[PDB]
UniProtKB/Swiss-Prot annotation, chains A, F, H, J:
Domain N-acetyltransferase: 4-161
UniProt note on regulation of activity: Allosterically regulated by polyamines. Polyamines trigger conformational changes and induce the symmetric closed dodecameric state of the protein when they bind to their allosteric sites.
Keyword Nucleus belongs to the record: no
Protein's name in the database: Spermidine N(1)-acetyltransferase
One Pfam family this sequence matches: Acetyltransf_1
UniProtKB keywords: Acyltransferase, Cytoplasm, Magnesium, Metal-binding, Transferase
Top-tier EC class: transferase
Family to which the UniProt record says this protein belongs: Belongs to the acetyltransferase family.
Binding positions for acetyl-CoA per the UniProt entry: 86-88, 93-99, 126-135
Function: Involved in the protection against polyamine toxicity by regulating their concentration. Catalyzes the transfer of an acetyl group from acetyl coenzyme A (AcCoA) to the primary amino groups of spermidine to yield N(1)- and N(8)-acetylspermidine. It can use polyamines such as spermine and N(1)-acetylspermine, but not putrescine or cadaverine.
EC number(s) reported in the record: 2.3.1.57
Site annotation Could be important for selectivity toward long polyamines: residues: 83
Length: 169, 172, 172, 168, 168, 169, 168, 169, 172, 169, 168, 172
């Protein structure tokens, strides 16, 4: 519910982030630079602390459990656009939480940051992730063919987007 | 009154947590020498990249027993023109105590008796008229109605720009 | 007309002499990213200390045959608020030719079609009403009458702050 | 007719001119710049950076004709954004068809990349058509994606695959 | 049973010990070192360097078991040299078979590499055999190639291909 | 007359400055740092190019002869005060020029720079320098005893001052 | 009773407090500062700088009592500006007479300086008097020289000479 | 013949080197770092001037024509081995020159540098390059399968080697 | 014997105290990559200025239970000539145990089996003949009698230079 | 007696040194740079740790009391000379200790360091310091007139010296 | 006749030549150097250093005649070591008498120094004599103090006082 | 004779070409402060990385009319031990003129009269006996026969180490 808190990212949160990647068995990124080990991340966090291209938030409930992470990357101030990304921790998955966070991300993007467009990438092999964004008003704008090498094969992804104007109506 | 015991001390690193515990209640893009921030760590390093900067001067208010009351900021400071923007923040748990006028005196008293300035201006949201009547009462006067100046909380808003001159604050 | 042939090119080091040959006719404290200067050498190094700075963008105007006409400056630029101050200068030997409107279009056309801004403001001396009626004619509108804002040529003077919004400049 | 040569420092002026004309914000290794001096500094800053690679087009009389950029090169996903700028003077002389392929050829034969994609304004059907006949195919029609020349315009994302290029 | 985890700074002592035993010159990102302090410095110096990637092997009680190195990673030719060191204590417990594959799995599924090869002393037929049954095949028998333990020894170069691994 | 031009100081002017010191047979200063040789000066000029404490001007006539140098040092923005100093070249001396330059310096100090007070130091062994400033409205505010070791002995100097308010009336 | 000791880094807090009270702009080696962190940084920046020299005053229980500054030390003209700040708590206890001399003693016996001078507000006749009886003499009455506490105040410049001190 | 001179590499020679790469239509390397443009090379040459892992030589005839380049890379001082590489310019090709240079390279490797082993890589699609080295006493030690992506396909290469002891007998 | 349990580990910062506790018993000018020292702090910083240096390699000897036995040093190392100077030190409390030969084997065994060297030389004072007969027994042979080479303890002294080649140490 | 130990100087010893200066009421030096406060010294010690011009030693007895400090400064390797200086702490003064330390300093200078000449400076107002060095075989080589400003007046000093050859006979 | 001018960078060659002839080790701000390049670097390194001050001697035709050095300048004890080198060509022309005084004049009138002293080889009685008649007096005869030209030679230390110079 | 006119001047950057034109005739691995080189550019930068180095001192010999004759080098220089290695090179076009002894005097005369050294040693190939008898005649004496010391031109060779002491060179 309104349980969930968003909060900006600090050094302490890095252990948490790192943990959200082991389970993932794909390449993890930090400001377009790739990393596997805590120490790479930490050098990276540090190197990018002043950097305005990406922006992150930890989800915590009322008890301060670590729930997930909302992140906006490729933030472009001339085109007022950003790409959005979400990770829900393994234990906190399948709890109805995604919607709330998507909506809190869109909230911050449009109401605070004053962006024109948020877009995202979903693998086509995630019908129910796809449907979910559609239920939050994301429309498919692209079917990107063999875009990413993830787990043994090139995969296709959907690019889905919402407009500031659609959101605020 | 008990407003008599409020003191101003220049801000320092150990005061940053308090600063950062004041934008979580602002929900507007806080700056540091013209650079935005969200995290404490972002603030930290900015503070460090700006310790030697004359364009802004910050003072923390504590009462007689060192409770942290609020912040007095001064930004955009020409010694050519001798003009500065001023801003004030009171911590929420201290807002029911009419401390504002008192600090505004401290900031004016700093700018004109010590820093030898000529003019002090501030912005105030059109939609914050309580702010306005307070400034007015300290001798501030409207000089601009700034149209859609700052994007704030969903939309662009209009702000009052208000000023007071050194001679006014001083000349009996 | 012949205003049609004026072009805007981003400023570069080799253009500094021309810049510096424009404050000798200004007799007011010229800046560079919020830092005063008098000598060419002062300007030079400032330029170098500020090549990578996003807060200001400068464009030199030349006609069809590269005669140096004047300068278009843009300063104080939030991409948070998407606001900028704008200023224009025409070299004296070119002032009898009504080039101003034309450049003001270029600067507005840059700020709103390319740099995607929301608002452009400028200051003008109260005592410079020719400046005012010109800005007005391009859709600029008064938003402030800034009292004793800038110390200028002996005294403190009042300046008009004037603005125009992107939607106005754009919406047929 | 034309030769594709790796860009040198001597070539920046020519790059720089292609940006007074082309009429949007110009980026070097994702860093914006308007000034030649900005361009120059960024140039040295990224001299060994492998994320972007640029070739200049020359002819017999050693005229500077065009530009081919691979940007956003990713050595995990083996993909890169491709752009071509031909100087206005040499505009309609029918070169691009070749260049585009020579570019593709580099990416696929020399660089071992798996996918190349580019953006083209919807408001430029001519361009879309041309790419299509070089083997590019639409994979996205991004809505109000770029703020170009007043309004948030629509862009095709188009792409071709190594396999499809090498085995076409 | 065992987990493969990215190497952290905490792990250097463990790496460093694997070198008093293993008994030749030890290199980090091609830089030699004998001293822990040398190792440490080089570690930070190459923290983001993508030419080499190391995974540490742990178990349930969080014991440090082994090491998997990809070195010489080349993102054009999509190949890398592979090495495995298992701590003497855990030597014969039959782990390598798995590790080797987990390593191969990373290189091929996560890293998109096309070829992996390694060196094995001729004087170590046991080792050659093991790799062979993980799909490695001899492609070179390099003559008096390494000066090991007194004499210039012979080494097999062995290798496996992405395609052959993913489609085996 | 209005012959004389003031102009800001550049690198080229340093040779000229240096020349104004040989004849002087006292210590020469540059932003409170002492120098004798061109190369010291040049390192100094460079080190202080961004420095706002001092400010200099070359006098040139209509022909661009080098006439002299007007300088303001110890510029203090909190007390809006500065100390002023003038050198008229040997050849251009005794020509009635001083007044004009004093007045041009006071002009710039008060009308441009917006200073409250300009003060100066004159050796007591310069009755006619003293009288001159008095004729430009400087009043003596101090007789500083054995202030400077110049040429074989400690000397006394007059501190003389004018106020912005007096000037502009 | 009291000891004069060279200022250490430990003493900055104490200096810093003498500036919330004393009520004007505070300078270290001519550099302004309000913040303790500003003070600290400047401190290290000027650690060997010989233009300024500061002694802290302590007592038996090791209480921090006062401050003696020589600033503007000039090794050609052999002169220096002198200031004394006594903590408000210890204000009227009659110490300064001694301190002032101990300061003078340093400047003249240890430092070989020829002249010491100081500034005192006209609006502070008490202070002028005190210095006078330590051998300081007025040499200037500087008109509207400092902007203190609202208005441009008048200051005495007062001074004493080595010869006159050593031979008094 | 004894016509041909070897000479160490200097900054001037870089233009020449660069020219030996255009024709090549494969990736060019400099101390394991990849380059295409003169300016990359020049930054690289500079960065590696003190570096002992690689070592180069220009061939010039009696007239000082640029003939080719002999290079030893991956020089390993513990295993006293190095990999050797040769480029004969387009115009000077097919002139009987290779032998002489191979032999001059082997000369320097064994007699000057005191190396144990020189090895090389030849594409299997170069039967006559292969045979040539064999005629200079290189023996095949490996058939490396799909080692390099050169020109549209993974290729196999021969690793060929000679020993210091074989050479000097 | 118990010589069998002595191990060699490359030296590191935490081993410096031990090093420095070995020149107080030497009373001769100790070096570090061709730079003298006396204090521990002098040694410390030298160590740090020389961590990445290939010209010298140092190994600390510990027994089975990590008692600190002595030091094996290798200095002046061309890989051109493949030659090195070698030196050994045993802590005094461990000298009554004939450990020397054993370490000298370790150092020779390192230089020739691992570091692939050609020649190892050392110096020995003419006045230290016990040193000499020991080296001799490991296959070292005199190659120089260096006249007044090193100023030592009051005067200049003569030293034996002694060497052994890789082929000798290796060829059965 | 042979009680007294000399030992090289470390960071820990600085507190001790500093203490040997308060009592002194003259300027204290560190590698020709002047200091009063611990923090100046410490920056100085650090800056000069690698510096071979000066060399210091703490005296400690068998119990590890701090007894004094022997120092050699202005060490010149071409002229094989050095100036020597000694401080005996206030509490350990007048105990017969000086001789032993002088002799230990001369020992180290000549036997270890291989110097040709040690010289020293004594104020003429220290007849018994002077006589002491003479009893350790220092001969007066100079009466330097008004050499140092120490404590309110310029003073004269004796320069006294011994030769390596005289010592070792 | 002759002018004393502050040394510039242009003058190093001339300094440098005075050292192939003069025939011992040469120092700049106490740093040894043999090479012109060593000299040059040290020059810039010490450009603002006030411990040493050098004047070059010129004549009408702007010939480089000599050198006057104040080294070891101490601003506490107000003393400095003085040296003069005249180029061999201009050796016997009788200039030094003046130079020496002009040097003394600087030290005493412009620099406010209290004592100047110099070293002269015992084996050079001519030189001693000359200084004596410029007011220098022996204060030390340092035994086997310098290793010059084979042997440890003896040197006079000679000196003059401000007071004695200004009141002579 | 004409040997009387040979002068020694400390080496400088502009002298590097000449240096580098002397290893092309050496065909042995030339060094610079213990670092090999082949190209002129390698030499250049090494020179620059070593201008402030006391371990080696180099002097160029020119005749009366500045013809470049040869090089005097001094390397490995303790002022602890006061020992140095010395080397000499004469340019080939000047070798038929018996200049060697003369320079060897200059180098000895430098080391002992000026640099105040105690001992000067050099190496000479066993296979270069002309070198040997020349050194011998200047008072140099064999102190070592260094077995397979330097890898040279195909094989490892033996070198004479030879020395002379300051007292010998000086004491009539």
């Amino acid at each position: 519910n309104s349980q969930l808190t968003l909060r900006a990212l600090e050094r302490g949160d890095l252990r948490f982030i790192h943990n959200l990647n082991n389970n993932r068995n794909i390449m993890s990124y930090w400001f377009e630079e790739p990393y596997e080990s805590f120490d790479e991340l930490e050098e990276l966090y540090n190197k990018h602390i002043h950097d305005n291209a990406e922006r992150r938030f930890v989800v915590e409930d009322a008890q301060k459990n670590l729930i997930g992470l909302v992140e906006l990357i490729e933030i472009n101030y001339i085109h007022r656009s950003a790409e959005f990304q979400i990770i829900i921790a393994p234990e906190h998955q399948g709890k109805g939480f995604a919607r709330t966070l998507i909506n809190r991300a869109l909230d911050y993007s449009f109401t605070i940051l004053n962006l024109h467009k948020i877009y995202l990438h979903v693998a086509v092999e995630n019908p129910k992730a796809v449907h979910l964004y559609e239920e939050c008003g994301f429309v498919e704008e692209g079917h990107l063919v063999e875009e990413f090498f993830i787990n043994g094969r090139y995969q296709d992804v959907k690019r889905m987007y919402i407009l500031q104007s659609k959101y605020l109506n």
